[PDB]
Ligand binder design. Sequence first.
Ligand code: SRM
Ligand code: SF4
Ligand SMILES: [K+]
Length: 456
Amino acid sequence: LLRCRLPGGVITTKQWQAIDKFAGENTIYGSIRLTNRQTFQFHGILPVHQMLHSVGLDALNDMNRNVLCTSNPYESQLHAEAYEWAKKISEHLLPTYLPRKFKTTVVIPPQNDIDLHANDMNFVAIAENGKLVGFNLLVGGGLSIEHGNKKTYARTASEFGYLPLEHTLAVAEAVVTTQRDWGNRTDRKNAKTKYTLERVGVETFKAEVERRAGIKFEPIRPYEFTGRGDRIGWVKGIDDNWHLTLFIENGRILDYPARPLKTGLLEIAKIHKGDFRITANQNLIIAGVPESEKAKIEKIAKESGLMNAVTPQRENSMACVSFPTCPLAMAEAERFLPSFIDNIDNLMAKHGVSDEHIVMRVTGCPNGCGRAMLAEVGLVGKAPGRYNLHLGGNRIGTRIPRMYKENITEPEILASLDELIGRWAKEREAGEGFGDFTVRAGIIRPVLDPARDLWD
Ligand code: SRM
Ligand code: SF4
Ligand SMILES: [K+]
């Protein structure tokens, strides 16, 4: 197992060709696994660094994880700046020992594709006249929990305030350091920033941060999110540039019977003029496509089975790696999801909601890599074929879903959803998402204060 440090998910066609070669040539699985933190994973490496190094990549003692960045912003121009700043925060933070691991992101409203609430440090971009002017800082998100341990909990990030662009690295560093010092010294389950903030208090942590930075935060600047999904298909970029976002189930890239997904990608990488971007949804964007080249690029993806139509539901569903490679797995995730979404699609069609979607995620074990804890409907692995069903999150990802049922099987899970999806389909209001309806209809109480009311 090895994972590369790829800030913002941006990788070159040249780098893509090198890892494709390594994937198939020197690993047991021969696949390329796009992760939900905008990077890739090789499984079963039987040198990796010399090849990484040769193409300019490094595989991060260091508790710093991959820094994310909105991959395909509605205002296409803001990306490059947001991206330059994701790459700087990532280099500035490179080695102070952190009690636990730290996750950071650069978010471009109104897209929360990078699921900011699962992260320790979040820089939410504020722009004027197509120009970034600063960042709204959000601190304290974290999803991991322990089955039956009411002292562990998932938490959403808290707003600290606004700060001008010039004070970005000083803040990122003070946050990191106040965590480094204030993180719990005994146990590692209470180390997380979400825990420290709850122990000292958000204002207390905030002041140390201001004190350490040498600044005083400004009031939070207006921002809202409209979704967390990728823009599957083509979108107009900047100038004559076009963007093709390819859906990749579980982000597992491999050639399949009649579906040369991996070869399709190498063939695309050979002709593509710009680079690629790995999304926070385990998909891939072919960036910087001149209008002239669209026919060429699309034909290849069409050929390889990379543009195969799937329902909106499957486009908005995600699962962690889990079995067979994860030694912490309790129940399948990646290998369970396709079949499960088939079963879900059927139920959505049964209720006249086929054109709709529910943010549905499957996490293998309670560590939470599948981000089911920010899902409208989450599945939390407990045992072989057994999961805890959570409900009540929203489309944008600012609400943690309370456990609705515990230790049940797929058939039991399916029956519970058949029932409620039906309810929602006949009783929801105008454009009312699933999680919201389950909170409005009394199906489940909402988690209003994580550290205190998540658990029943
Ligand atoms: C590949 C990926 C999930 C996916 O299907 O895409 C993944 C897979 C694993 N993560 Fe993760 N996590 C991934 C995103 C996440 C996320 C979600 C996110 O960051 O967006 C979380 C949730 C937020 C959080 O951290 O609170 C997450 C929470 C964990 C943790 C629990 C962390 C904690 O604070 O307790 C562990 C276990 C640990 O570190 O003790 C874990 C451990 C693991 C391990 C390495 C298991 C291990 O330690 O042996 C997994 C290996 C499977 C394999 O063989 O490949 N992984 N992990 C992601 C790797 C991301 C990356 O590129 O760096
Ligand atoms: S959630 Fe658990 S099963 Fe899934 S990849 Fe993370 S550690 Fe493994
Ligand atoms: K995906």
